[PDB]
Every structure is written in C-alpha cells, then in structure tokens.
Amino acid sequence: SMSVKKPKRDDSKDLALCSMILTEMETHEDAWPFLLPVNLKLVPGYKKVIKKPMDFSTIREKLSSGQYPNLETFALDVRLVFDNCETFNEDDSDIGRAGHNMRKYFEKKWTDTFK
C-alpha cells in the first residue's frame, strides 16, 4: 500500500531474457505456423473468429519497440499465439500439434528463466 512495498525484484534483465526466449521460439522447428501473421485475406474464417491475432514477428516488433510494460504482458501475447492456434486448429493436425509442442516448450523456458 502507500509507503509499504515488498522487496524490489530485479527486473533489469527481463527485456534481454524475453528476447532470448523469443529467439529460441523463433528457431524451433515447429515455429513455422507462428512466425508471421495469419493472412486474413487468404484464410477463411480467421478474421471473424480470432478477435486478437498474434504471432512471433508481431511479438518481436512489440518487444523491440518498448510496447511490453512488463514480463507478464509479454507472456500473455506468447500464450495468445497458442490459444488462438487451439481455437482454430484441430488437435490432430500438424498445426494443432505444433501449437501444443510450442506452448510446452515456452512454459518450461518461462519457469526456468524466471520462477
């Protein structure tokens, strides 16, 4: 509350560390469905159904330009990529499987880097 703070967690490396995690997501072999925005002209249904499209390139641009206020807003966008993927793709599809795999990969890096 006012003049009453928990001890200050060192957040000075969060930016660099989120960048590293993102690099590792970018370079994973199953990243291909996620590297670029879904083409809303060429994919029937996407625009209407997925209210907040997100992809790794858009996360990278937001990261690089100080549009994440803290590491939680960064994780929210990464998770949004996978939540979108599950919303539109059957579990038993290459993309559906890609999304599950990438989510697992992300969540482990996240825990090991920060928790």
Please, are residues 33 and 57 in contact by the beta-carbon 8 Å criterion? no
Question: Which residues does 24 contact at the CB level (< 8 Å), separation at least 6?
Answer: 105, 109
Burial of 13 (0-12, 13-18, 19+ CB in 10 A): exposed
Q: Resolution (in Å) of the shown entry?
A: 1.5
Residue 55's CB is within 10 A of a number of other CB atoms, namely 19
Q: Which amino acid is at 88?
A: F
Measured CA angle at 36 (ends 89, 18), to 5 deg: 100
- How far apart CA 33 and CA 21 sit, in angstroms, is 18
- Angle 73-76-80 from CA coordinates, rounded to 5°: 145
Cα-to-chain-centroid distance, residue 30 = 14
Q: Which CATH number fits domain 1-115: 3.30.1330.30, 1.10.10.10, 3.30.2270.10, 1.20.920.10?
A: 1.20.920.10
Query: Which ranges of the chain would DSSP assign to H, the alpha helix?
Result: 14-27, 46-49, 56-64, 71-88, 94-114
| Residue (of 86, 105, 115) closest to 21 by Cα position | 105
Extents of the domains making up the chain = 1-115
